[PDB]
Amino acid sequence: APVAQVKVIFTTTEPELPESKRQLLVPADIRRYGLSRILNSESMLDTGSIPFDFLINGSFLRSSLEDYLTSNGLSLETTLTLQYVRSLIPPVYEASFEHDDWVSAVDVLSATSPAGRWSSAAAVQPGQERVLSASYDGLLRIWNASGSVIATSPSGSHGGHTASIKAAKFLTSDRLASAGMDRTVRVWKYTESDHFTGELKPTLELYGHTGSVDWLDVDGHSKHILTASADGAIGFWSASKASAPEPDASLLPGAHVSTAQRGPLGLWSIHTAPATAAIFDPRDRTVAYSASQDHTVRTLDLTTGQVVSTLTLTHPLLSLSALTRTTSPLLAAGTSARHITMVDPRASSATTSVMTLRGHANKVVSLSPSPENEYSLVSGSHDGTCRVWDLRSVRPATKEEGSLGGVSEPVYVIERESWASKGKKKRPVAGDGCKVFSVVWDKLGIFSGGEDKKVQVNRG
Amino acid sequence: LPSPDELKPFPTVQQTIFRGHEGRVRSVAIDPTGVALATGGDDGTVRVWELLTGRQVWSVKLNGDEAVNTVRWRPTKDTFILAAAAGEDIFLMIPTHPSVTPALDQASRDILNAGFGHAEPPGKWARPGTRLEDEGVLLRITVRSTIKAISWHRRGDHFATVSPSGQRSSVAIHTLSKHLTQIPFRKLNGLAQTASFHPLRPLFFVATQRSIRCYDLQKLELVKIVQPGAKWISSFDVHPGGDNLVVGSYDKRLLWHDLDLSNRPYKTMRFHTEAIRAVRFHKGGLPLFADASDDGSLQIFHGKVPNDQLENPTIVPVKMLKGHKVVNKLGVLDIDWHPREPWCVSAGADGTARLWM
Numbered sequence: 001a002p003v004a005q006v007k008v009i010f011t012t013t014e015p016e017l018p019e020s021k022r023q024l025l026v027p028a029d030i031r032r033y034g035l036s037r038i039l040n041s042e043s044m045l046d047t048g049s050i051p052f053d054f055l056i057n058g059s060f061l062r063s064s065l066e067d068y069l070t071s072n073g074l075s076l077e078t079t080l081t082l083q084y085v086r087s088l089i090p091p092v093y094e095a096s097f098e099h100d101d102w103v104s105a106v107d108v109l110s111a112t113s114p115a116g117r118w119s120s121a122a123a124v125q126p127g128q129e130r131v132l133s134a135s136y137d138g139l140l141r142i143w144n145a146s147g148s149v150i151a152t153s154p155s156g157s158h159g160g161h162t163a164s165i166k167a168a169k170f171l172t173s174d175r176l177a178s179a180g181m182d183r184t185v186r187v188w189k190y191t192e193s194d195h196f197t198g199e200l201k202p203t204l205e206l207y208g209h210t211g212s213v214d215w216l217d218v219d220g221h222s223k224h225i226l227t228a229s230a231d232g233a234i235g236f237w238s239a240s241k242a243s244a245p246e247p248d249a250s251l252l253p254g255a256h257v258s259t260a261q262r263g264p265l266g267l268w269s270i271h272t273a274p275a276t277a278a279i280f281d282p283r284d285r286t287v288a289y290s291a292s293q294d295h296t297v298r299t300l301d302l303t304t305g306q307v308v309s310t311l312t313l314t315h316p317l318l319s320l321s322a323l324t325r326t327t328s329p330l331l332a333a334g335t336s337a338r339h340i341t342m343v344d345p346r347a348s349s350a351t352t353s354v355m356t357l358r359g360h361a362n363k364v365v366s367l368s369p370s371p372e373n374e375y376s377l378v379s380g381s382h383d384g385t386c387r388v389w390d391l392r393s394v395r396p397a398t399k400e401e402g403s404l405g406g407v408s409e410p411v412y413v414i415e416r417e418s419w420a421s422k423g424k425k426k427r428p429v430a431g432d433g434c435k436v437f438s439v440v441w442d443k444l445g446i447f448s449g450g451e452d453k454k455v456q457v458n459r460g
Numbered sequence: 461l462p463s464p465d466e467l468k469p470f471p472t473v474q475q476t477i478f479r480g481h482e483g484r485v486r487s488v489a490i491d492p493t494g495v496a497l498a499t500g501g502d503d504g505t506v507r508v509w510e511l512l513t514g515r516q517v518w519s520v521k522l523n524g525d526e527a528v529n530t531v532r533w534r535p536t537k538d539t540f541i542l543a544a545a546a547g548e549d550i551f552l553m554i555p556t557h558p559s560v561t562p563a564l565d566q567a568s569r570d571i572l573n574a575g576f577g578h579a580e581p582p583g584k585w586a587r588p589g590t591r592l593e594d595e596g597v598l599l600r601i602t603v604r605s606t607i608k609a610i611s612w613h614r615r616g617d618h619f620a621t622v623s624p625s626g627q628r629s630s631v632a633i634h635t636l637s638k639h640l641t642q643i644p645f646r647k648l649n650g651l652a653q654t655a656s657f658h659p660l661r662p663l664f665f666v667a668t669q670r671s672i673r674c675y676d677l678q679k680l681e682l683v684k685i686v687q688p689g690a691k692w693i694s695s696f697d698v699h700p701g702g703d704n705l706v707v708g709s710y711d712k713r714l715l716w717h718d719l720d721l722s723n724r725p726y727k728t729m730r731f732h733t734e735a736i737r738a739v740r741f742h743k744g745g746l747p748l749f750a751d752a753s754d755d756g757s758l759q760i761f762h763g764k765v766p767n768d769q770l771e772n773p774t775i776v777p778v779k780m781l782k783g784h785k786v787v788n789k790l791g792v793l794d795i796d797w798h799p800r801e802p803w804c805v806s807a808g809a810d811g812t813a814r815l816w817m
């Protein structure tokens with residue numbers, strides 16, 4: 001007997017399908033399961049068991065096809081264009097790196113990581129990637145594959161940081177950069193005698209900011225550094241002593257007004273509130289984007305040191321991240337109001353066509369894009385969780401925003417394993433013991449550090 | 461008349477907890493730049509925090525025997541000076557904080573030192589001792605009786621203290637640039653509870669148990685007497701425009717005073733089963749204010765002052781905040797708003813301070 005059917009058109013972003021076989025007659029009662037084995041058929045793509053998900057006009061298919069048809073205004077002889085994607089391999093918990101204090105920052109040195117690629121173009125690495133962890137105790141720590149400390153930064157008494165560190169990233173395998181509450185930015189040189197022993201030695205002490213330096217972006221090719229600080233200023237720095245100007249001696253620990261001490265190439269007070277983020281533009285290093293608690297995203301022309309554009313959102317901004325789409329520039333802005341706002345820097349103000357990422361229950365203070373999917377990214381929040389997003393997933397906004405723009409919901413939630421371990425089914429209030437301060441997404445995995453004194457690793 | 465939905469933004473959720481104090485947290489205060497929080501409590505320690513993360517970046521134990529009753533920042537951004545009252549002393553300190561550059565430290569120290577050598581007394585100005593000096597506490601001002609309230613003047617050269625059992629000396633005005641302490645109001649008659657300066661005019665408010673006296677600071681003369689009609693006033697706050705008051709009382713009445721029209725309350729608000737401990741206006745342009753009660757809750761209100769369109773203040777309760785644990789029949793003891801954002805911090809008897817947004 002001829003079971004009722006639905007006509008579908010398969011399309012995709014991921015390499016694909018011959019146009020001969022992309023339109024298809026399919027049982028109306030079929031589901032994600034059946035549709036993906038059809039895709040895994042001899043006929044279609046001969047992939048044995050790749051799990052697929054299906055997007056219809058921006059929504060994932062959780063039920064049968066007919067249910068989608070009836071849910072909307074389509075008539076069961078409507079032609080459905082299903083775009084299929086790779087099902088997210090769930091990033092489950094794997095390990096934790098224990099610290100004696102809060103983990104403020106996290107970064108990964110891998111073959112695919114930005115610093116690793118810059119390194120190849122000083123050494124390069126095969127199966128021995130490094131994890132950098134900054135802590136509120138003022139010390140940087142370098143970890144390896146089996147979660148043991150290879151290197152540890154010297155204390156403040158020996159040229160290290162003299163206060164809590166707030167941000168730190170790999171410049172290359174050769175060089176690090178870090179910043180904190182001592183108003184300094186410190187450039188380090190990392191040497192590794194053998195693969196369980198390493199050493200960190202200060203290259204520069206960088207002075208300039210009038211407050212805590214809370215955000216850090218780096219470029220390993222040109223040896224340059226971007227900083228956002230509580231003083232409301234964005235700092236542009238060189239990590240080489242040669243091109244770095246002389247400091248404002250009044251900002252020096254000596255004044256009452258060993259390591260070389262230098263200043264910035266540019267320090268611009270462009271915000272009326274704490275500057276929370278500053279990143280290099282992926283397409284153009286000459287351009288930088290900043291985000292602050294003054295509700296603004298500002299674009300910076302680094303060569304002229306001028307604000308060529310200003311975007312003003314509704315809420316304070318605590319984190320910023322750049323995405324490739326280079327069809328356009330696309331930024332993700334974490335807000336204190338618990339949501340993310342997707343923006344195009346030159347809009348001047350958010351149009352009605354603005355995307356929002358909802359799901360977090362607290363301040364979103366960290367962001368990192370997917371290494372393999374351009375459309376995906378992960379966020380770190382003070383709610384204690386990390387949420388993975390797929391920007392292809394989008395629905396209209398409800399009375400939540402009074403039907404303004406579109407809303408995306410997480411495709412995965414990384415819970416804090418420290419909390420989940422207790423077996424309790426009651427969550428910490430206000431991220432009491434589990435706040436996430438920094439998350440980084442590498443192909444080696446998803447690494448997140450925070451208040452629970454742990455760097456949490458998640459991978460498939 | 462409007463609904464809470466139309467009256468956004470206002471704080472709805474608990475987002476940061478400040479832990480470290482032992483015993484009740486008696487006071488909370490956010491620094492002028494909205495970056496740091498200050499707390500004081502039973503353990504006699506003053507603690508300064510990173511606001512959004514809730515990290516303790518600095519602390520000091522002023523007095524072993526006396527709890528810190530109140531902490532209030534100097535309202536100037538050109539300095540980083542914090543005031544703390546414990547027992548009969550006022551301490552003026554410079555917290556160790558990332559915003560404190562060598563330049564800002566010096567500017568702060570200069571402000572504290574300027575009064576020196578200006579040609580049972582009301583106030584005793586002196587160094588607090590090497591121990592406290594090493595931690596950035598540079599001045600101790602000793603008054604006659606236990607201090608329950610500190611209120612700065614906006615320019616930061618004057619601050620008042622209130623000692624409910626100081627009798628004739630219950631209310632003192634201190635002048636920082638002269639190291640001077642005066643008792644300017646001598647027949648106040650009634651028990652002084654707290655006091656405040658005026659946001660735009662040379663006026664001074666003194667709250668007793670039942671009324672609030674308004675003084676001309678230039679003439680040291682009484683101008684008017686505000687009558688809340690409460691049996692015991694616990695606290696009050698002045699709107700930035702200087703023409704409105706909210707008054708809290710142990711009677712559990714929250715009162716809005718329209719000073720332009722009368723000395724009696726415009727509206728009376730009862731949203732608590734226990735005494736109201738503190739009230740605070742948002743000072744940065746947002747039409748919000750809040751009260752703190754021993755029932756463990758904070759009630760957030762929408763409060764709009766009169767204008768062209770408005771003949772009366774628009775008062776609408778938007779949200780009650782719960783989360784503080786009541787301990788020994790004490791709940792929330794103090795409130796403060798962020799300078800610009802709709803964020804408030806609360807002092808808890810449960811040994812915590814909590815950030816709401």
Ligand SMILES: [Mg+2]
Nearest residue numbers: 701702703720
């Ligand atoms: Mg008037």
